Symmetry: D2
Subunit: 116 residues, 4 copies
């Protein structure tokens, strides 16, 4: 699990469940080609969408379908989705995880990176 | 601009919090918090003139924001009773401090920015 | 009364970010982003005049903040290439939108305020 | 499991905040905070097994994080003296509590997630 995305719902005080996660990689033609997709559990965490072998150096992008969740929960959201664009494995392999705290019309993204 | 400013924004409505009790305390020689200044948040959420620059001496200060009052009125059950921030003041010169709070029913974030007059 | 305002702060130095490039795009009918506006962040970190109220159509918008450029000079290698904020503007009608982004070398938070 | 857990990160370094002191106080009937539990944040940046469910009671609590000491060790000048989270525990029934804090030299955020076990 080189990449893991954790999603939490602030207003409900419970992990956000059933939000779509989509991962893209920048290609040589500066175009985003799909990399992986996932579905977040009731624990609020989606993992295993990427393996170390498939993961390689490049500029990625993670999309979280925060729009559909709040319609399902009945809230009108401001943000269509959350996008986190970052270079990966610039100097050797590393472990990247992206945490997202979600509210209607407000969200935060934090990334902690460990070498092993 | 006052040396201490407090701004609160609401996540659920995307608007600044209105009518939130804010309390300021100052440390004492006996390590006991003493009341320093109290205010009521406006609709804009920005409060100025709470403490005068001359009456803002170097020391340890605490600012509290009434989280329960805002949410018990609007109808959402709070997780936090209130938000408290503690910091040193006037270590070197009379700087201006701004304390910004992003408010959510079960979360909040606090940031501090300093401006030199 | 600029409908779109971008506010950027630097948590590491506790001061507003200075000399930050910001770009704004609007989605086209071909589902492709097309440049809409751009600017340069001042010392205060608050930007105005990026767009006009009259020329603010009801479409999907994206805001890009050149986080990598800022922290490259300051000497701390940043995690994020940049910051992206995607939203559907003028869903119910004209209004004022404020986008506030708190920056850290390895984290950032975005909050939206409507007048 | 553990009724209350506190998990802390660092923002500028992109690493968990290690060697950070955590102190928990419980409010008394005399409005006096009693030292309830104290711990040190692990290398993973999280603290677990802080309180027993039997020891945990239905009252107002408080969590303190030693922000000042952490930045002194790493060599960066911090703004905040400490981080304080206050809430009402077991208002209705026993539930799991998790308090998350993301630290930066001049800002920090606190989020709380509660689920019925």
């Amino acid at each position: 699990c080189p990449l893991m995305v954790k999603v939490l719902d602030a207003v409900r005080g419970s992990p956000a469940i059933n939000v779509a996660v989509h991962v893209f990689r920048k290609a040589a033609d500066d175009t985003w080609e799909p990399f992986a997709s996932g579905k977040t559990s009731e624990s609020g965490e989606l993992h295993g969408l990427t393996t170390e072998e498939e993961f390689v150096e490049g500029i990625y992008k993670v999309e979280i379908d925060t729009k559909s969740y709040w319609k399902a929960l009945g809230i009108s959201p401001f943000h269509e989705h959350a996008e986190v664009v970052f270079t990966a494995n610039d100097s050797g392999p590393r472990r990247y995880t992206i945490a997202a705290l979600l509210s209607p019309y407000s969200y935060s993204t934090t990334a902690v990176v460990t070498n092993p």
